[PDB]
Amino acid sequence: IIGGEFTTIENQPWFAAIYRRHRGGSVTYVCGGSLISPCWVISATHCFIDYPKKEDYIVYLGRSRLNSNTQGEMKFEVENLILHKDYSADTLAHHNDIALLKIRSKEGRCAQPSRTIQTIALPSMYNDPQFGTSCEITGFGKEQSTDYLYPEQLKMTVVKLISHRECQQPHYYGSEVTTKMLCAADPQWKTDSCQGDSGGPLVCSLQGRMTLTGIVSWGRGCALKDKPGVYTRVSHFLPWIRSHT
């Protein structure tokens, strides 16, 4: 996350931190995800497409630090790793960038809600908030494009939904963005998602509820003028999510 503020998992209790075993070389962070039910985390296919073996991956819930354990964290194995059969990346755009992980503890239980772990609601079919709406994104991604290290404490920031009309100005992304994506950015271009934040939640209030409206997917650079973050548009994937779940 570029800009925004350091937060803690209690403020984003549906955030899932996904790691890979080595191999190796022990264990390194992969990407963020979101808890959408006790047994299921949703994330982005591009995070896993290179190493698609569920046995490599660990999922933590209730965790606020990248390389240190947090009181109230729980560790999970990945029982099923489900990637989108239609994932494609062009130059910079990722299409169908959505993935499902079925989680299970060694014991072998799904998640229990607690002050650090809660599920996040999915939107109803084709329900998205209005453009201009303020949403939150969260993650352990880079704090600057040029950094080589990742923050050790979870960050969040607030970005605003942009209309498709506007995002598909050539001046923005043009044709690279599809009705299967949403755009969101800072009106002053100083806060954004960055590498390491992929798979994480774009969360909005939408008719009563904190909702998973997007998954962090792609963009040109991070926090660059007229280059918003692009998110996978969850409300256009309900059937995908229902069948594979």
Partner: peptide, 16 residues
């Protein structure tokens, strides 16, 4: 695929 322990190797970034 590289060889790497690289975080989010196809994220906004980033070689791929």
């Amino acid at each position: 695929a590289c060889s790497r322990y690289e975080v989010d190797c196809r994220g906004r970034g980033s070689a791929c």
